[PDB]
Design a protein around this ligand. Structure first.
Ligand SMILES: [Cl-]
Ligand SMILES: [Cl-]
Ligand SMILES: [Cl-]
Ligand SMILES: [Cl-]
Ligand code: NA
Ligand SMILES: [Zn+2]
Ligand SMILES: [Zn+2]
Ligand SMILES: [Zn+2]
Ligand SMILES: [Zn+2]
Lengths: 220, 220
């Protein structure tokens, strides 16, 4: 009853940052940055908020401003990213996730996205919104979303610059490699939006890569 | 190996947010917001970074652009506010802290501010930079800085909207009252400035109060 409200603060041109909040872990109120991303009048969720409620808030806000929600993408299985897939499905707004993410959802008892991509990249919107799979990291399934009609990267929960955070589902042997490949093909990054931090730049790749290796020897 | 670097961003007309970074215990790489505040061509540190390095960076930075560093104020005895007081003292830059902060630093074996103040209010710079003491909260000594002319409030480690965090030196019994006082005396603030969070508005007083009462009953 004192969960801070959803925030929808424009980050660039046809590119919003929705910030939502929840507890569980024992970190207290954890904030979750996701992007809304406009294509003409088509809105796109770049993850969901934690809850159905704040998804409907997010949708109505855009719906009410004369954009028509064309799809959801979730960047990994955690509700960080998937929290709103139930709602979207019950409104039969199309939801997207990788085969890996959908398999992890199934395992977790969590309604799956109604669409599956696979492979290294999905062009959710040709030329405009790209999904890229660096490999296992934060989770085994984590993917990121590239904005070519700008130079924005949604790292999601993968980018963890201050320390890797939740490790429960994490693949820490693999992460430093996955990170490396992200920093490589995703140089030329203006903005790099993490899940759980302030928005930065292409260093957050370096910073992540660094945090990644550190755990790799701090637990062997 | 690689801490994030200091950041010095423009917050308002003679008011900046320095962000500094350090690994804190099992809390990992924690970021720390303080203000630089310009009066005429005189510069004031509203807290300090963690280290001398980052303090010297912050200082020379400003001296570089023609502003003379007239003093530092430290909002509480922890290193997140006081980390710079020895560097400051060793350049004969005046450092300010409350008698309580100073007593707590001495306890802690930590070099004290060379200038001491007391009471509810203290006018560091008449009409321009106000110190307010809510009461025990985050720590027993516990001060915030009001900026009238701009209507800005540095809440420090006292604003903890997402959960209270370090309660090693905390006083959770008293904290609720303190925040109640702060909330009330410090409406007509849209620019609240937490220690460890995003900059926010007056609701941060609402939310801190909320977090504090909650940890008052969750701690019995
Ligand atoms: Cl559903
Ligand atoms: Cl996915
Ligand atoms: Cl995947
Ligand atoms: Cl920041
Ligand atoms: Na991700
Ligand atoms: Zn996650
Ligand atoms: Zn997460
Ligand atoms: Zn503190
Ligand atoms: Zn602190």
């Amino acid at each position: 009853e004192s969960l801070p409200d959803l925030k929808i603060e424009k980050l660039d041109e046809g590119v919003y940052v929705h910030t939502s909040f929840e507890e569980v872990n024992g970190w207290g109120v954890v904030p979750k940055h996701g992007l809304v991303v406009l294509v003409n009048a088509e809105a796109y969720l770049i993850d969901t908020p934690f809850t159905a409620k704040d998804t409907e808030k997010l949708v109505t806000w855009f719906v009410e401003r004369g954009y028509k929600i064309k799809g959801s993408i979730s960047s990994h299985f955690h509700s960080d990213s998937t929290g709103g897939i139930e709602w979207l499905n019950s409104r039969s707004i199309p939801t997207y996730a990788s085969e890996l993410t959908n398999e992890l959802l199934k395992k977790d008892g969590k309604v799956q996205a109604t669409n599956s991509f696979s492979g290294v990249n999905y062009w959710l919107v040709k030329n405009k919104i790209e999904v890229f799979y660096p490999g296992p990291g934060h989770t085994p399934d984590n993917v990121v979303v590239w904005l070519p009609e700008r130079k924005i990267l949604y790292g999601g929960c993968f980018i963890k610059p201050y320390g890797l955070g939740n490790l429960g589902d994490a693949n820490i042997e693999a992460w430093p490699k996955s990170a490396k490949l992200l920093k490589s093909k995703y140089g030329k990054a203006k903005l790099v939006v993490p899940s759980h931090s302030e928005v930065g730049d292409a260093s957050l790749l370096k910073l992540t890569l660094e945090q990644a290796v550190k755990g790799l020897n701090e637990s062997k």
